From a paper:
Hydroxysteroid 17-beta-dehydrogenase 13 (HSD17B13) is a hepatic lipid droplet-associated enzyme that is upregulated in patients with non-alcoholic fatty liver disease. Recently, there have been several reports that predicted loss of function variants in HSD17B13 protect against the progression of steatosis to non-alcoholic steatohepatitis with fibrosis and hepatocellular carcinoma. Here we report crystal structures of full length HSD17B13 in complex with its NAD+ cofactor, and with lipid/detergent molecules and small molecule inhibitors from two distinct series in the ligand binding pocket. The overall structure of each HSD17B13 subunit could be divided into two parts: (i) the catalytic core domain (residues 29–259) that contained the cofactor binding site and the catalytic center and (ii) the membrane anchoring domain that consisted of the N-terminal helix (N2-P28) which was highly hydrophobic and a C-terminal proximal helix-turn-helix motif (P260-N286) which formed an amphipathic patch on the protein surface.
Numbering used by the authors:
A (entry chain B): 2 to 232, 235 to 274
B (entry chain A): 8 to 229, 237 to 272
The structure:
Amino acid sequence: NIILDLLLLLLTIIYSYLEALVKVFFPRKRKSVAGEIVLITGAGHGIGRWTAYEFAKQKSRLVLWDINKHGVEETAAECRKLGATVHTFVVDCGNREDIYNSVKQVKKEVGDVTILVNNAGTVYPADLLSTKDEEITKTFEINILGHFWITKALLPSMIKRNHGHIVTVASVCGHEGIPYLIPYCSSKFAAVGFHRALTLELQALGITGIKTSCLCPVFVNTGFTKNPSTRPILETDTVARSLIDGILTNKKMIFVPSYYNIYLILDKFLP
Amino acid sequence: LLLLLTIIYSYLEALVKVFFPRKRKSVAGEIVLITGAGHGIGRWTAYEFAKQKSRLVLWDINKHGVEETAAECRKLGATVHTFVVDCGNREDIYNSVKQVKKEVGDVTILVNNAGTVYPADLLSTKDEEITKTFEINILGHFWITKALLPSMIKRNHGHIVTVASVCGHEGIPYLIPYCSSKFAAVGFHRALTLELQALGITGIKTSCLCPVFVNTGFTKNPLETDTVARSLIDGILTNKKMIFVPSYYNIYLILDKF
Ligand SMILES: NC(=O)c1ccc[n+]([C@@H]2O[C@H](COP(=O)([O-])OP(=O)(O)OC[C@H]3O[C@@H](n4cnc5c(N)ncnc54)[C@H](O)[C@@H]3O)[C@@H](O)[C@H]2O)c1
Ligand SMILES: NC(=O)c1ccc[n+]([C@@H]2O[C@H](COP(=O)([O-])OP(=O)(O)OC[C@H]3O[C@@H](n4cnc5c(N)ncnc54)[C@H](O)[C@@H]3O)[C@@H](O)[C@H]2O)c1
Ligand SMILES: O=C(NC[C@]1(O)CC[C@H](COc2ccccc2F)CC1)c1ccc(O)c(F)c1
Ligand SMILES: O=C(NC[C@]1(O)CC[C@H](COc2ccccc2F)CC1)c1ccc(O)c(F)c1
């Protein structure tokens, strides 16, 4: 217990310092996203909202979607103060029909989205037998099925121009199971799979201009879930910074904190 | 290079399997519910359970195919009950669980095998088919497990078998909706294992079957059915959590993480 704490803590410093060393010695080049049409779902609060702020500083043209009218317009007001041109829409990102109709409006009002951030998410923590079936369905409808309908609507223009970036906001819950989050983990594993199979298909289809990134943070202080009872302290602006740095550098799998990948590599060796 | 790692891992495993073997439990007299048992993996898994002397509950939307499996199981000496159930339909699942309870009793081993696939690139897929894929390959696992888990918990004895794929571990072009639904099946199994553990439920075991392509006619040809059914039964009896078919496929998965 004292031995395994000091063992993994040393690697939380070893992997982290090794990465910050390679990041200066052999760096990945940063692209520009200025003037790109960025659509962010769940832009009304938390990660989506702070990702919208990063894109506003990057000089992108923003399209913000959310079911919360007040929340998304509040993010847009901050983005406009940052100097960005912003369009907001009230869209249920778990509703296939609402998504398609809103994509026609985005096309007519702004133009063709070049960067899609599938951020909107839901969760109803409970043990399997305490979950409501309506909750399981909502979780899948928003966390994964919505990613299909939005990507399918926006991908044809990106393919035609051979230029785009599909950003999947998953979780470390898409890599490991967590108790009381069975429907949620399952939907997040589905998001990781969509990103992986999408990357491989574009490659197989000879589509070189469309990039893919998958954001996998640990618990974040956004109010999305109730703070763990007794238990890595992660703030919203840190996650939004990690995501923007990942997108600009065309990084496929963005773990937040980046060192979290050692636990994932370790699990693939355990008895 | 990789052809050698395949022979090395395979022979290392067959060596440990005789030197330090896992003990095999009995499933004789257990009430085993197998979904999509009207053909392929589910059918040949039903045959393995019939030889194991289990009581069988076979579900499928293919009535003729499921009664054909049942006839073979009965020849093998097993008692078998068949039901025509859409394992992607929540209402049909719940009503059928009422009928299973009234006619057979409490299921102790659940095999979530029923599955669907519509190969096509993302932009060629039909939205109705993406929904069907999720409804059957994962959402159905929630409704069936939720219905059958309460009796297993009460008795602290059960086994939840998730039939996923290597597609639940790696992405495949032309199988985006399918891979996504299979990743969801792997995640359900992983989070379910960890939750039972956290809740102090020691008697309920979990296994996840992840085969590569199998010659069942599930998809057009780019591993035989009886081989997969044998691997699954050997995995269940030995309480193995992750059953890759072929078992050596795990080296490619360990390699991808580097
Ligand atoms: N918070 C964490 O601990 C954590 C960790 C890892 C990953 N994530 C993921 O990050 C994403 C954003 O979560 P967050 O922590 O910023 O949460 P949040 O509660 O701060 O905000 C999520 C936003 O999504 C919106 N939304 C919900 N349902 C929607 C729908 N049907 N249509 C449109 N918008 C909808 C909400 O209105 C809200 O503004 C989610 O996909 C979540 O699963 C969160
Ligand atoms: N065949 C492969 O290459 C392969 C590889 C890995 C995993 N798998 C998985 O193995 C499982 C079984 O596939 P298979 O290869 O034996 O296919 P199969 O075609 O031989 O049979 C699948 C069975 O599922 C039944 N089914 C389909 N929809 C159903 C529904 N709504 N309700 C009830 N039953 C339903 C079908 O009637 C059929 O009998 C699936 O979960 C599949 O995804 C298959
Ligand atoms: O950890 C996240 N939230 C915190 C919770 O809200 C509260 C704690 C429970 C886990 O509780 C236990 C775990 C193991 C044993 C016993 C527990 F009780 C998960 C939900 C969380 C939620 C979304 C994410 O996307 C994410 F990465 C992390
Ligand atoms: O491999 C399985 N089926 C085979 C196909 O039926 C036919 C080939 C395509 C993949 O094609 C390509 C992949 C990469 C590059 C170029 C391709 F053309 C998948 C579907 C298969 C199907 C279910 C499973 O569960 C599984 F594990 C495997």
